[PDB]
Amino acid sequence: PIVQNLQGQMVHQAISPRTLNAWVKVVEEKAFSPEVIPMFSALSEGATPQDLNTMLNTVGGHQAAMQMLKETINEEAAEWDRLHPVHMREPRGSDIAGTTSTLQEQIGWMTHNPPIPVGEIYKRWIILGLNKIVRMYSPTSILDIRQGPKEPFRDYVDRFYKTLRAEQASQEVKNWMTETLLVQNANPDCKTILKALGPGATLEEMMTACQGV
Amino acid sequence: PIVQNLQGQMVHQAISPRTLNAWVKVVEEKAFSPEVIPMFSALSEGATPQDLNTMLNTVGGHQAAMQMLKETINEEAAEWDRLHPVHMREPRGSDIAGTTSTLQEQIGWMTHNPPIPVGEIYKRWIILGLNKIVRMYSPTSILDIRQGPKEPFRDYVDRFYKTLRAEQASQEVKNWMTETLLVQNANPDCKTILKALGPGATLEEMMTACQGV
Amino acid sequence: PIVQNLQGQMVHQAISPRTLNAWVKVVEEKAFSPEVIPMFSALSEGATPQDLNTMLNTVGGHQAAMQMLKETINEEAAEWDRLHPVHMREPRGSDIAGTTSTLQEQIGWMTHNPPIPVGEIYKRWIILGLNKIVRMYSPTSILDIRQGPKEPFRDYVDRFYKTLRAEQASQEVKNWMTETLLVQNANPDCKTILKALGPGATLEEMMTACQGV
Amino acid sequence: PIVQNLQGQMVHQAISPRTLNAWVKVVEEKAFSPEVIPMFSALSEGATPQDLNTMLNTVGGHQAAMQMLKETINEEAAEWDRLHPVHMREPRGSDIAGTTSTLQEQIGWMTHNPPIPVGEIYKRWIILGLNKIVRMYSPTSILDIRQGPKEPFRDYVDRFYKTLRAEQASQEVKNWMTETLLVQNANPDCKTILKALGPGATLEEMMTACQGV
Amino acid sequence: PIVQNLQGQMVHQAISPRTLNAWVKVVEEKAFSPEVIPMFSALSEGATPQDLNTMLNTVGGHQAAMQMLKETINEEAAEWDRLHPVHMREPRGSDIAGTTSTLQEQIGWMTHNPPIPVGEIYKRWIILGLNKIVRMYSPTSILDIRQGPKEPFRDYVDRFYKTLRAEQASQEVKNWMTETLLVQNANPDCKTILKALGPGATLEEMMTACQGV
Amino acid sequence: QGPKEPFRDYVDRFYKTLRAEQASQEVKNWMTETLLVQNANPDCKTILKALGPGATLEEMMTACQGV
Amino acid sequence: PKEPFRDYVDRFYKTLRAEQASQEVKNWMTETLLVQNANPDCKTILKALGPGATLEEMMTACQGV
Amino acid sequence: QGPKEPFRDYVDRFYKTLRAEQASQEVKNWMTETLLVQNANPDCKTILKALGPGATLEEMMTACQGV
Amino acid sequence: PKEPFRDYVDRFYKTLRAEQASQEVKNWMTETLLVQNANPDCKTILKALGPGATLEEMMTACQGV
Amino acid sequence: QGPKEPFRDYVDRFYKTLRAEQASQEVKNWMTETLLVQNANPDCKTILKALGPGATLEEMMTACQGV
Amino acid sequence: PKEPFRDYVDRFYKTLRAEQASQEVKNWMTETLLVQNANPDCKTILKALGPGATLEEMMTACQGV
Amino acid sequence: QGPKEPFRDYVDRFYKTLRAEQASQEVKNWMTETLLVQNANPDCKTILKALGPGATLEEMMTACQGV
Amino acid sequence: PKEPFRDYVDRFYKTLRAEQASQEVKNWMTETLLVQNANPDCKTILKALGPGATLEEMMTACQGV
Amino acid sequence: QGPKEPFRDYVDRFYKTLRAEQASQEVKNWMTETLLVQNANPDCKTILKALGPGATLEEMMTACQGV
Amino acid sequence: PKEPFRDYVDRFYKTLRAEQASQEVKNWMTETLLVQNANPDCKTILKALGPGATLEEMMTACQGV
């Protein structure tokens, strides 16, 4: 992170040891279940690119996942260099990625007016790679999720949304999936309740109708 | 949060990374079980509206829940604008919600004399939305909770109160529910013990009578 | 808590958000099992009455438990007013409870010479209420605890002491309970080993005799 | 702990609330399993005797364990007074134990040149008492540990070493126990593999030979 | 760690008590499962050799593991003394290991220009020893890992990679192992799917082909 | 509600009981909304739940007649 | 009896094109009679819509039961 | 208490034993309150628990006679 | 024998309106005799109230057992 | 797809249905890619998955004919 | 029928060395005929490669099925 | 110890073996205390454990004779 | 044989009041003979006390076995 | 290795296969050390593991002949 | 056949004290012949030591198999 020093000038604060341990727990124990993206996004709040690379040094070891992450970062760095050609110096994609930039360059950019938020930029490329990894480690297609013959509708909704949260689908597809597939893949008793609501039903109406089904 | 700087003037302290991770754990792993409201209320102590929005950026992803939260916030923001028409400037509902206000406006209001506690105000609108979400994700009506034929009365009381804590019921209804339904839905042996106490029984008397039932 | 400011004068430090979350976890998940009293006592180290009330705002919601806590606090506040009649001003019971006192009154009392430790006083009234609540939520009388026919003696000793720790019993009764009931309620094989030690046996002798029984 | 104040003079920092809660978790939930000694040793890093007594106020409640701890501390305090007769004043055993010494005496001793490290001294007496308690609560003699007929050798080695770590045995006895009993109490198939290594085998050789046995 | 003091000069900050407790949890509870190396690497960020030795004082007790660690450190210290003969003074291997160096020597080296990063050097020797220990405590050869007849391919990939992460294999061997053994040891149905991809398949292609197999 | 009981008869039983019930009007409001659906016959209950909680008694009867 | 509801509808509206009642009557005819002359199962399903149902609602609800 | 034993007889057994018991008056207080109910016959015990712990022995006998 | 307790009460008080003892006797009559002439099960339930029971307590306790 | 149905017939069924389906072109894109493989016959599905998602319909038919 | 695919290939190419069609024909002969004259199982496996398959792909795919 | 073996005979077996055992005197001290009780016959072992670890061999034999 | 140990003790001490040996003998008589003339089970239990046992220890140990 | 196969024959099978194997010399080193023991017959494998990984092929054969 | 290995050793060395070959031969005799004349099971166990085994290794390994 970045902290105002005793002289009032902004200075680096290293990402604290037990924060990195909380990220190591998230990488090692949750096996890229979709909550890894929220927890990465949270633990890296205000992280400089040096801090973000300090976190990715423990995605290393998951060498298949790390490869997908590195190539996604490189792909986005090239796309940055394409969208923003050459005119502190303005950061190139490798400067955003914290490989070629100095720490003082990173903090300078993040503390500029207007800010050049290279940390919270690079964090988007990393989150996009983590989305690819969460897809790879997903156990099921959304089309495989069906309600158990005695499964509570809440628990099926959780299985469904947890899977949907991993999918590649655009929001327009996720809307269609929510309405059609959540109804379609319910068990026949609960499906009968859901069908009676008609196509415009909110998830609130669906679940409140199916309490104790 | 808000912290007195080295100059003695009040300044922003960002909600720390591992605090946000503790909130991500509460959203992701506890599936809007009713303890999500206490834990939100605790983790957001002294949060500015910018901090609260930083926490809600991880209710996003639970898109059905996030919709209920956004529309509840907008509903309360309109109700604020109705209850407090136009006369720092006094905050409009979108200023309470931290969308249109600056961070310095938020801290200025929260540090005024008397304080204008826009953080601990907005936190009530958020908690009201989380109550709607906790209802939606509740597994059972309070009327579905019945003591198992060999369930310890303590464990049934916990199942009952945990469900009652999710319900929409006003306190007058919750009082009636406690006295009549907790007795009514006990198993017949324990119900016989509870009935013998009469209608005025405290929960202490009920549980102390039913130890080892 | 209370912290020496940059001017050297003592000032309030708010009980930190993730400390309150650790208390919410203790209230919500451990269901007033007896370790709730140690964890309350620990998390509230150096808490002012405003801090303690900030912690009790999450016992609220457990409305039966909260009622027992409020009436125990009020009972102790009246007993304080009785034991210390009217002569900073000396704190009345409601000043100890942090309802009628200002934060500066609370810190002034806690930092006086000699100290008037209104925080670590009020914390005793709260712990006394938590003892009543731990009794109510206890699953068994100490007289119901018997060693399983193949239960290791250590595990029965833990079940016994965990229950004994919840009981109302004075220390003289707890001594008698330890010696007579721990022997009496062992299974007949282990009971035979324990009886052979005679009445003066320490718990160390009992357990070291019963390793691998 | 001890911290350099803004004037550069050393001053007390109270053992933080959530550190005490992490110790309460270790005492309450791990039932004096042998890792309680490492976790006590870690959480009490740089603790003054006042801090250490603040931690032992939650071993209280485990009244049998607390008695063994108190009498071990008193025994060591007398042994200190014997080994160091009367000549800040030099600390007596009760000054090491933080009962008769002031906080400023404790910090003065710990910050002297050479240091008089009354905290990290007293912590040894406490750890010696915790060793007695870990023995009492041990479930088995080391002689009771035998490998299951299909138990992986790693898991038996863990059961064995975890038990050995609780035993009274001197290091010379622990060496003999490791070599003879770990071989002797293996199941006959794995025992056949281990015997083939001869008496000089390292634990590395034993385990690498028994992978997938 | 190392922190800039109020005078701007760099000074020691002790590795905080609850950080050491998080390491004790990692050593005691995770039984040298391979995530112990990431968690050591994370918790020891910026650790001086005195801090690292403070962490290794709780690998002590796992006396077989501690022996492998000590001899690996001594082996690397001798190799350091060989690779860097005698010319602050330049650190010898025992100065890197923090046995013969002073704390001020350690911080002086770590804060030099260019830095002499004795902490993040010594941490490599420790991690190399932890790799030996993780091998010893590994439950299986990579050749023993086979997919269950109904095991999801994701779960077999996790079992495989978790085992591969423990192995001695160089990266060239790990590449060959990934491609040939992951295919070879799949169950015959999933193996049929994997074989159809040909030898060049990425892990992404393998897993996306085997979703719901 | 009985296993074959017409919904108009069950409504009559319910409100006839509710007049004797001694709880306050606030509780009776919650009762009329929650219990009337909860204790309905499983077929009739399935019809009623599809109306949602805002339905009037007239609408509930109009839907459930002949179920 | 067991005629698919779309076929019963087609018969009904084909007849309603022929018989010559006034518009208010034809409205009432569709709304009451299309339900009341339906198969007993279909009639039971259709009454769950109440009196406001358009034909599209009736067909999408019934599905031939 | 026996499976058919009159409560007055069980009280006589209990207090006759309590006079021989060697524990202090503090323990005997706890005994008279806790054990007398705990070891009562399950029917009689069900009557006694409904009186609550503040009941006198006279009240306990007055309630349990003829159970 | 098995008469519902409300009916036994009604018979008793209907009789107590007729027989002419003084008020102190009538008080004692309700309190002792309404219990002691009850059905044996009802009598067993009613004695659990002790001597202080009003008729409302007696009826709400017994419920016809 | 049927247990013995030729893949060209299943493709005809699928796209004939897809023309009647009322969802937007964005959804239909996702449908044509995902559902066509997902609902294929297990043998034919095994052939299709080996082509990967980038395969054209012509390639899918060319592979699955005679499966 | 059940001849191992390598032996069928060897027979085919041994024959293709003898019969005298032009190069474009020989290319088409290997590509179409080596598949179309294969055993029915082998033919089924080989068509999964499409028309671009080299002989090395054909043999490493078929493995004699 | 055998299922019927007199404790004096088991002590003779044990110490006769202990003289042949090659471990150091520190280990033999731990052996004589721990193993002698641990490997005793379950009845005899129950007698021995009640003496506690500080008992002498003479006391152990004096207690276990005729068990 | 199966006589409760308290009764055997009472017989023994009643006899020891009568027979006229000197005090050192009477001490030895209680200590050795009260054990050695006991029932074989009682004797087995009592030897577990060793020679130092007072009569109160003997009775509280034996309990009539 | 076969259930009765002489170790010299299994070594010949293994290295004859290893010459055909297309992996690099780094992989073949790991193969010769790991697989030769791992795939040995359970009796022969038990002999081989007792030699440890540093043993030469000559030592492995010298130990396993006649197993 | 089934003779305990210590007894076979004792017979062998008792004989080796008598027969008069030179020292290099006696070394080879102990090393090869003590194994090769052993019982077939013992011989199988002993070859697992290789040629370097001293008699103490041979006895502590074999244990009479």
Side-chain angles (χ1 to χ4, degrees), chain E residues 3 8 10 12-83 85:
Chain E
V3 173
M10 295 290 259
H12 187 229
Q13 182 194 31
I15 186 166
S16 63
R18 192 151 37 78
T19 299
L20 291 173
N21 187 47
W23 172 239
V24 174
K25 289 179 181 179
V26 166
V27 172
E28 295 300 324
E29 305 196 339
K30 303 195 180 183
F32 298 100
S33 184
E35 64 265 53
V36 171
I37 291 156
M39 289 171 195
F40 179 71
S41 187
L43 294 171
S44 66
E45 279 296 290
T48 63
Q50 176 168 337
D51 306 319
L52 294 162
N53 291 341
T54 308
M55 298 183 78
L56 299 197
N57 291 349
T58 186
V59 180
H62 302 269
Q63 66 185 356
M66 186 59 167
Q67 173 56 38
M68 294 167 67
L69 196 48
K70 286 294 301 291
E71 73 192 33
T72 303
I73 291 161
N74 293 344
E75 175 178 319
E76 289 299 314
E79 180 66 355
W80 173 268
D81 288 341
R82 189 190 71 82
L83 287 171

Side-chain angles (χ1 to χ4, degrees), chain N residues 22-44:
Chain N
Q22 294 173 24
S24 73
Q25 291 293 353
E26 173 66 357
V27 181
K28 286 179 176 177
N29 293 343
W30 174 90
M31 287 180 165
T32 54
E33 296 165 18
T34 300
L35 294 174
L36 182 58
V37 181
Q38 177 74 4
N39 293 331
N41 173 298
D43 299 343
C44 198

Side-chain angles (χ1 to χ4, degrees), chain G residues 44-62:
Chain G
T44 304
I45 297 296
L46 291 165
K47 287 296 303 291
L49 307 180
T54 61
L55 175 62
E56 183 165 33
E57 297 164 78
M58 298 175 76
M59 293 174 74
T60 55
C62 184

Side-chain angles (χ1 to χ4, degrees), chain F residues 62-63 65-67, chain G residues 44 47-48 50-51:
Chain F
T62 300
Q65 63 190 333
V67 71
Chain G
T44 304
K47 287 296 303 291

Side-chain angles (χ1 to χ4, degrees), chain K residues 23-57:
Chain K
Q23 187 63 50
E24 297 187 335
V25 184
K26 292 202 174 191
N27 293 358
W28 168 88
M29 287 172 78
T30 59
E31 293 156 25
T32 64
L33 305 178
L34 189 68
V35 180
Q36 290 180 8
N37 292 339
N39 314 298
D41 298 329
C42 302
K43 181 170 175 280
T44 304
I45 297 296
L46 291 165
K47 287 296 303 291
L49 307 180
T54 61
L55 175 62
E56 183 165 33
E57 297 164 78

